Write a protein that binds this ligand. Structure first.
Ligand code: ADP
Lengths: 144, 72, 203, 139
């Protein structure tokens, strides 16, 4: 009766180790604690839904490499609303809110994978051009 | 503003009436917690026009009823 | 479906609840060949999949729900690296603050940080108990509705010291000429009458 | 390749023969391909070289005639621009950031290659116009 008349904010405390060792951590206790705190259920339940929620401008700040200097629009909300549909064919993986993009679990890791592989392909282009220049330079010096 | 310092859910190589009370209190507190989280995310989905049916929550009322109801 | 050479997965272990593992041979839609710590030998029998692991840039984030793969390995890993490597003891899951006993003292509770948290929204800052106290103090203004901060955990987890700092926050930002002395001086009384040596721990 | 191209390329190749046997090392094959206007990756160079082992890469010597099929295979605008536009949106690229990523990602280069190619291309802020730098570095 005292608490339901109120609004809660929760703090869960967990004890790292039984031996009082300073600032060291035991997996086997900590997992027991994190189950007893209901944290793991909360995380599982969120994983069943749409865990990851990105503001469109943060999505741009992350995936500008994904989105072409041509394709970007006069607003980044619609820009990203298009670009993500380019990158992932089926909307069901994601949702478009008023303020955030909602993602099912894993789709962000996918976007980071394809982002990093494209960034390395760009680094391959630029490094290959500079390295080929040095090769040319020493080659023509030997010809000189 | 009120601050509550309460023992957590307990499990010991032996468990006795004291532990049974502690775990029943923690059942009640986590019922409150699960309802609060469920409310908060229905309200976020109304901020974001997303269907409620997607979200569900763990219901631990059957264990409260096991401990607390008549013939419990 | 993603599993390839140079993928990583978590595998169970009686010594530590999960081991990191390098996937050593591509998956084919029936038993997986894995590289590990300590050299490599495993083939791991799927039953009628191993938990699959977040890219290293994500791990160590301020919020366990900001991870891409959610599971007990990922959570345990984030908390372990933040605690051991970064010496950060506070973490968020959903709304829940999660606090881990550093179990030696820290600078972190200084009045400078108290002032740094005042007025900040809870996502504006790295997690700290003052961020929860501040959100409570905000919500009590935004609505007259009263606010409860529920500190919970095993005995010895640090519930009393967490309440101590949560009150020190209100008394610094709001407080003026005193509550703090009397409330903290009440603790030895309530601990004497109300605390006991249990089997697993004293106090 | 026509006779004129083959003759100029062979003459240059022989200029690179440091043993007098009319041959270069495998590790120079890529250098020769790049000097002739091609831009193959190190992976592509090793592939056309047959992914040689350390010993033959450092000491086995090949004449122009064995190099030639590989040069041919390697030999056969918007992508270069987008590759630089990755790091753009005022049309500039940090010299420090470009240096770090080129020396730490991909087929990592030395700091001296990057300093050499970047010389004269950065402005007072330490920003490089990458469209001009790209046209310059592709010639
Ligand atoms: N955040 C913290 N910083 C420094 N020391 C701590 C912290 N939390 C707990 N401790 C240490 O751990 C001890 C046990 O925690 P305490 O809160 O006293 O027990 P309980 O949580 O059971 O009431 C404290 O007395 C203190 O010595």
């Amino acid at each position: 009766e005292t608490l339901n008349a109120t609004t809660p904010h929760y703090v869960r405390c967990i004890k790292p180790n039984d031996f009082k060792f300073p600032f060291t951590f035991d997996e086997k206790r900590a997992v027991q604690q994190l189950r007893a705190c209901g944290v793991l259920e909360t995380i599982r339940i969120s994983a069943a839904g749409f865990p990851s929620r990105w503001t469109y401008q943060e999505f741009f700040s992350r995936y500008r490499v994904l989105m072409k200097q041509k394709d970007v629009l006069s607003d980044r909300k619609q820009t990203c609303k298009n670009v993500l549909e380019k990158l992932i064919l089926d909307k069901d993986k994601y949702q478009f809110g008023k303020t955030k993009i909602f993602f099912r679990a894993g789709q962000v890791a996918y976007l980071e994978k394809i982002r990093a592989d494209k960034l390395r392909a760009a680094c391959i282009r630029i490094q290959k051009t500079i390295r080929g220049w040095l090769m040319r330079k020493k080659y023509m010096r030997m010809r000189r | 503003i009120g601050v509550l310092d309460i023992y957590g859910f307990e499990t010991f190589e032996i468990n006795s009436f004291e532990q049974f009370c502690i775990n029943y209190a923690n059942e009640k507190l986590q019922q409150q917690f699960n309802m609060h989280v469920f409310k908060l995310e229905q309200e976020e989905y109304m901020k974001e026009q997303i269907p409620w049916t997607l979200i569900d929550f763990y219901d631990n009322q059957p264990c409260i009823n096991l401990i607390e109801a008549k013939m419990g | 479906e993603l599993y390839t050479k140079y993928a990583r997965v978590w595998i169970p272990d009686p010594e530590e609840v999960w081991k990191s593992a390098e996937l050593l041979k591509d998956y084919k839609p029936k038993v997986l060949q894995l590289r590990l710590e300590e050299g490599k030998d495993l083939e791991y029998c799927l039953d009628p999949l191993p938990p699959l692991r977040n890219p290293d840039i994500l791990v160590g984030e301020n919020d366990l729900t900001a991870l891409s793969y959610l599971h007990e390995p990922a959570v345990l890993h984030n908390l372990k690296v933040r605690f051991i490597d970064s010496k950060l003891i506070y973490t968020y899951c959903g709304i829940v603050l999660v606090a881990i006993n550093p179990y030696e003292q820290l600078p972190i509770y200084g009045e400078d940080i108290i002032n740094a948290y005042s007025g900040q929204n809870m996502g504006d800052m790295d997690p700290h108990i003052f961020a929860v106290a501040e959100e409570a103090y905000k919500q009590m203004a935004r609505d007259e509705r009263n606010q409860s901060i529920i500190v919970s955990g095993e005995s010895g987890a640090g519930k009393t010291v967490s309440a101590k700092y949560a009150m020190r926050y209100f008394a610094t930002v709001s407080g003026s000429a005193n509550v703090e002395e009397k409330v903290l001086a009440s603790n030895p009384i309530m601990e004497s009458i109300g605390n006991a040596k249990t089997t697993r721990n004293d106090n | 390749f026509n006779k004129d191209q083959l003759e100029e390329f062979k003459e240059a190749f022989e200029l690179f023969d440091r043993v007098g046997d009319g041959k270069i090392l495998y590790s120079q094959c890529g250098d020769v391909m790049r000097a002739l206007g091609q831009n193959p990756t190190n992976a592509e160079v090793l592939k056309v070289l047959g992914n040689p082992k350390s010993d033959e890469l450092k000491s086995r010597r090949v004449d122009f005639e064995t190099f030639l099929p590989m040069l041919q295979a390697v030999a056969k605008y918007e992508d270069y621009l987008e590759g630089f536009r990755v790091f753009d949106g005022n049309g500039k690229v940090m010299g420090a950031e470009l240096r770090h990523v080129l020396t730490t990602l991909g087929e990592k280069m030395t700091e001296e290659e990057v300093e050499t190619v970047l010389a004269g291309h950065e402005d007072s802020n330490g920003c490089i116009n990458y469209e001009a730098f790209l046209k310059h570095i592709l010639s």
